[PDB]
Amino acid sequence: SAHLQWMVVRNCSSFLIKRNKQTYSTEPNNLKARNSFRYNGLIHRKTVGVEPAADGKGVVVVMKRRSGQRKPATSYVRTTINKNARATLSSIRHMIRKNKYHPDLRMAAIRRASAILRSQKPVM
Amino acid sequence: NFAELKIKRLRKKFAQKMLRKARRKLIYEKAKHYHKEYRQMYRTEIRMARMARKAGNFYVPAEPKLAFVIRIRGINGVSPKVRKVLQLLRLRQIFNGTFVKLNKASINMLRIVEPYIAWGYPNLKSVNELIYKRGYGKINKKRIALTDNTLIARSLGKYNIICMEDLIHEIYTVGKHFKEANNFLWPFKLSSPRGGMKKKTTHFVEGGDAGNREDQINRLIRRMN
Amino acid sequence: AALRPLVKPKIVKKRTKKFIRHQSDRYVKIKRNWRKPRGIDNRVRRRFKGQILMPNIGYGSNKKTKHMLPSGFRKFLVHNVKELEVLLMCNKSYCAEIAHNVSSKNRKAIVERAAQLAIRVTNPNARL
Amino acid sequence: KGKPHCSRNPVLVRGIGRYSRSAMYSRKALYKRKYAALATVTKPVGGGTRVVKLRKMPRYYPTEDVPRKLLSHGKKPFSQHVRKLRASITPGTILIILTGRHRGKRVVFLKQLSSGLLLVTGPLSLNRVPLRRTHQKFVIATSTKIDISGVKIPKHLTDAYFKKKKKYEITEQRKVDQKAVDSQILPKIKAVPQLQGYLRSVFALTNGVYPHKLVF
Amino acid sequence: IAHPKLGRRARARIARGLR
Amino acid sequence: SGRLWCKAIFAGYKRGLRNQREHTALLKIEGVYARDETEFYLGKRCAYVYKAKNNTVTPGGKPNKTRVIWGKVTRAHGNSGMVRAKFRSNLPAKAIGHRIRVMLYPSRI
RNA sequence: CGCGGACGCUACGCCGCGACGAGUAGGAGGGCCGCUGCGGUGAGCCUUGAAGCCUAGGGCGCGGGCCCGGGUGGAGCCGC
RNA sequence: GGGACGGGGCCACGCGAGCGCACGGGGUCGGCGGCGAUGUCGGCUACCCACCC
Ligand SMILES: [Mg+2]
Ligand SMILES: [Mg+2]
Ligand SMILES: [Mg+2]
Ligand SMILES: [Mg+2]
Ligand SMILES: [Mg+2]
Ligand SMILES: [Mg+2]
């Protein structure tokens, strides 16, 4: 379940990191990257992940369905957005709001993608 | 329908606005009545000596019912029977002061520690300038100050003591409910005396600071307070 | 002219020197590390006047300005490129400090990647 | 509607009115005043019509914000303070300027500005000190006054006139208003005996002078 | 008039003399 | 074109007998010889002027060789005319007996 | 009419209010202090130079101590 | 009862609406001015030396 494996994963995983009186986490669908109950992506039934495009430009969005939970093959779903700056943030505010799908992760799933759009700019 | 539920919430906001108004007329009237009773209690202790000098007799006033007890000496080198007393008046540091009502059963207790205290009989002003300035409460074994009447009216509502000026009428004229407003007051934290004491050890008679000093203790509260 | 921290608080500290072991300079076999002296004749443990002070806990620092560099950044220790994806969200508070054994053909590709993400690196011109 | 009348009770001390709320009720006559009872903006196109939005959503958030701060009550910006004087300074007195590059010249006071600083104008023929702002704190007041009420000070000169802009060159209006005031002030100080060399010389200490001993 | 249980009608009639 | 300050001879830190607290340094002022006179010298900006080897900047001038340590006068001391002073940085022991200045200009007259 | 509302909560966490702090022999608890080794794990680092030494180089921690830059050195090493 | 023109004080005389000053649940400026490339501005700590205790 969920609270069972948080009581298991919270200290002896391998995606976990400890140095300089700090704590981070390298999960494949995490944001803010830090070990907490709400930002882990392997436990819940519903998970949000925001990644850079495999090409040079764009932002992919890894969702997760509910039907096939134990089938890691077709459990997630990837979409790709390669547009301007406003409507991408609107289509993420809509993906997380108007489906009532895990609404806690909205502002951080906008901040991280406004940092990918800041990132993929041609540097001066 | 969410047309009526708004007005129903506004009734509860107006009923308490009227309850603060009918508590702010009450504290003002309970104060004005006392301001009349303190004139009457000071003048009538003069008038019996003017009529007793018209004839040629004498007017002895009654012995007062309130003393103010300050510790002056330290924690080191203390007699064990003494230290129990100074922990039955709740005087733990140096320079702590309390208010003690008087009787035969508490003069003989305040006699055995004459070398460590300097007690007196306070005036009306130096009760104001100890409640308003250095007066902290005791709420749940803590030390919470006094910035409102509602901090008194929680722990003293069962004695018709709903403000500060009733607690002062109780202390000055010692009412029935003195214990429940003197265990409540945390012990005071006075400062060091300005100018300087004469000599700490000896009695006030031979030029010291200890012992009785019946109305010179307001010359040690205007100095220390 | 740099990467500005988020907020720049006034760092105050309660002691700026070190602690040295008692009778450290008369000998060489005494190191300058701290060892609480446990005699009975002694002057330090019983706090005489004008001697070497001791390390109590009162010299501790405020939890808001603890571990803070003078520039206003905290530190973090990085080996490869893969751990800088950690800091693309926590950016304006913590800084990276590249390890020692990393050779000089990789720092060319780490610092460039750590200029897109707008992450401060404490030692960017290490080897050349 | 209705005119704004002045405040009915006067002020006795700072904070305390002289009338209570009973003589104020009958003074107000509160016996006869009973009381009982945008973002969407459309536009045409020369398709269809488009509805624009005012104050649209951002395009780039930072990775971390800073929180709001609390509210105090009694903190005003500088242009909304009170302005003070000393007791001794009046218009027409004689001052001893101290700290400029005009170190120690005996000068003449005019007025108090709206920002606080003084309007200290020496006669430029005597002390080489024109109309020039100084500060009240740095000025020692020599008890020696002249009459001033027969002047016509211009109304365009203020702090916005002396305030810095950014070598230098003197504007011709400084030469105008300096001559215009000095041609009215100067016959008052010339007609007093032994003053045009007094304003002229400088204050300086020497052996046998202690400031707490002489009165000035 | 003070304690809220009894004098509610007294503050009632005061609300129906103050307007 | 003359002196616009007043003489003041530094005398000692605020010490007890077997301690010392160097953050409050005493002064004597030539002309004053009681505690009743020293109500003129409260809040006056005092200073200290020395000189060194290297060349340093100077506000409104070419870089000279001289340096300063500003300060402030806080309260009286004794019944004779001694007075305390709080400098920003605490003073050296080289100046016991030397000359510091006090100004007058934060006046109250 | 409009499609809008910061931060947080590793619950062994985070935040707030009060009084207190001396200490030998001695007792207990926390140690993201440290050494040498084994199961696990870091798609770890390494002859474009690892351990180890040196240092008037830059810094953090109450402290035990650690980390970085600059020199020598030449083949194996560390964190959780 | 006035005494046949009498001055000061009384928190007496179950939805009223809008505005502003404030000794009011812990500081703000919606205020400014001079110094800056081969000689100068900063660096508490870490190195040598002097002094007060
Ligand atoms: Mg003793
Ligand atoms: Mg004194
Ligand atoms: Mg012994
Ligand atoms: Mg202890
Ligand atoms: Mg060495
Ligand atoms: Mg070999």
Query: How is B37-91 classified by DSSP, letter by letter?
Result: HHHHHHHHHHHHHHHHHHHT---PPPPPSEEEEEE-S-SSS--HHHHHHTTTTT-
| Distance (Å, whole) CA A48 – CA A30 | 8
Q: Which residues surround ligand 1, an ion (CB under 5 A)?
A: B 77
- Indicate the pairing of strand F66-68 with strand D139-142: unpaired
Q: What does the H/E/C string look like for D115-137?
A: CCCEEEECCCCCCCCCEEEECHH
| Distance (Å, whole) CA B156 – CA B180 | 8
| Distance (Å, whole) CA F1 – CA D104 | 8
| Distance (Å, whole) CA A106 – CA A94 | 10
Helical residues (DSSP H) of D55-190, grouped into ranges? 159-162, 172-190
> With an 8 Å Cβ cutoff, is E18 touching chain B?
no
* DSSP state, residue D156: S
List the determination method. Answer: cryo-EM
* DSSP state, residue F40: S
Give D205's strand partners. Answer: F3
- Do residues C114 and A122 lie in contact, with contact meaning Cβ atoms separated by under 8 Å? no
- Resolution expressed in Å: 3.8
- Which of A73, A74, A69, A49 is CA-nearest to residue A61? A49
Count of residues for chain B? 225
Coil, helix or strand at residue F7: strand
Residues of E in contact with D35 (CB under 8 A): 19
| Distance (Å, whole) CA C86 – CA C113 | 13
| Distance (Å, whole) CA B167 – CA B175 | 9
Chains that touch F (3 or more CB pairs under 8 A): D
| Distance (Å, whole) CA B8 – CA B161 | 33
Q: How far is CA A104 from CA A38, A48, A89, B62, in A?
A: 8, 10, 16, 75
Give C77's strand partners. Answer: C97
Q: Give the CA B97 to C1' G28 distance in Å.
A: 40
DSSP structure string for C48-101: -TTS-----GGG---TTSSS--TTS-EEEEE-SGGGTTGGGTS-SSEEEEE-SS
Tell me how far the alpha carbon of residue C25 lies from the centroid of ligand 5, in angstroms.
Answer: 13
Angstroms from D23 CA to nearest CA on chain E: 19
> With an 8 Å Cβ cutoff, is F36 touching chain D?
no
N- to C-terminal Cα separation, chain F:
23
Q: Burial of F38 by CB count in 10 Å (0-12 exposed, 13-18 middle, 19+ buried)?
A: buried
Diameter of chain A by CA atoms?
Answer: 49
Tokens for D168, please give them: 């230098």
- Do residues D96 and D140 lie in contact, with contact meaning Cβ atoms separated by under 8 Å? yes
Q: Give the CA C78 to C1' G77 distance in Å.
A: 17
- Do residues C12 and C23 lie in contact, with contact meaning Cβ atoms separated by under 8 Å? no
- Indicate the pairing of strand A24-25 with strand F46-47: unpaired
Residues of A in contact with C115 (CB under 8 A): 123
- Indicate the pairing of strand F46-47 with strand D106-112: unpaired
